[PDB]
Amino acid sequence: LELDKWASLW
Amino acid sequence: RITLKESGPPLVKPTQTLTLTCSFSGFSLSDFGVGVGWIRQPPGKALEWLAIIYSDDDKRYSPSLNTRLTITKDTSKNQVVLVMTRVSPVDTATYFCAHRRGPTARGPVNAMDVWGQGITVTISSTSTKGPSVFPLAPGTAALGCLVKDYFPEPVTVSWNSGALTSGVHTFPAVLQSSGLYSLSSVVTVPSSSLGTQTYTCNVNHKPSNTKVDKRVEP
């Protein structure tokens, strides 16, 4: 599953 | 403040292409990270995620509908467009577009905070058509009227020109495989009155300018 646009911010 | 509104055709034909537009105000797609998504809901079903598009034009579609969906945005107009191809009766649902906050204050992107009214789209190869009204012939007795094969919604039903209201149950129409609707309206009454009181359903399908008064009895 690819990650949402903001996952990386957490 | 932020308001979104969906627009497009309420009636689309199988195989034809459905084009929807989301007009918004109170926010612009130039605001960092802002998103606008499309969510649909089939009558009596759960929400289904369709696609999302952001300020930088980043896009994502639901894998299952990916080869059928195309999402775009026009900043000059504050509008987002969704195009769905080769639609079928199963695409009949209410379509909603929603706003998604961008990073300011991080967690608030984890949600779609403002939604549009939603727009009801029906997929049918059918043309306008008035209904045929049949009796549902009958201590408590039940009687009614079957309003069949009409298109498109809606239809209105009353009993005894509005004089009869208690015990009445006009059900939600069902879209048949034929692409035509069918709905029933029933009223529960005392058996004793079955021989002295008359029961007439008043049916009105404005789309076809069709009115019918159906007297129902044993």
Next chain:
Amino acid sequence: ALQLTQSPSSLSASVGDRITITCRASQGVTSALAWYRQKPGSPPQLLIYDASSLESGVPSRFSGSGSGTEFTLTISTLRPEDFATYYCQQLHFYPHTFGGGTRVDVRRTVAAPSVFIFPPSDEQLKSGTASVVCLLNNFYPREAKVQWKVDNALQSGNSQESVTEQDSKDSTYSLSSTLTLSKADYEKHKVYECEVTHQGLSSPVTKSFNRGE
């Protein structure tokens, strides 16, 4: 795909009750889970964002908790405005999944349905079709089962049904089922029965009629 399972799918409660509902994720979605309340005819309304944060403007009675795979939504005290359907959504993975929903309705004493069966009209029989209908009137709870039988043969794929919304005065539901057959088929058979299953009935009830008699 990431599966989001909502529990319980359906729930009956009364004003002033304290209810908690869950949403399970097949994979961890960290804190990226939102909760919405959707009233019939209206669009979804955000209540909780980021799993635990109350959305500005939402009543203090709503709260949320969880992280990873387990999440809950709690309503300290249920109001009338709260009898609706609730959904959770994870926005950690693409695609953004929604749960199947949790339907919250008004609780009343169990009421078994009043079943009636209606034969096709002679006028319709000419159109070339026969529609026989079964009415399940004023029951509770909402779930019910209608099985059609023609000369004892279980009918499948030739019926449709719809349910009315919970009544505002008596809190009951009513269901309508329609069995559709060709005139030819209709005349080829004798007994038409509608068998209803419902928690208010110790044993399934059958309403029927014989085509000629």
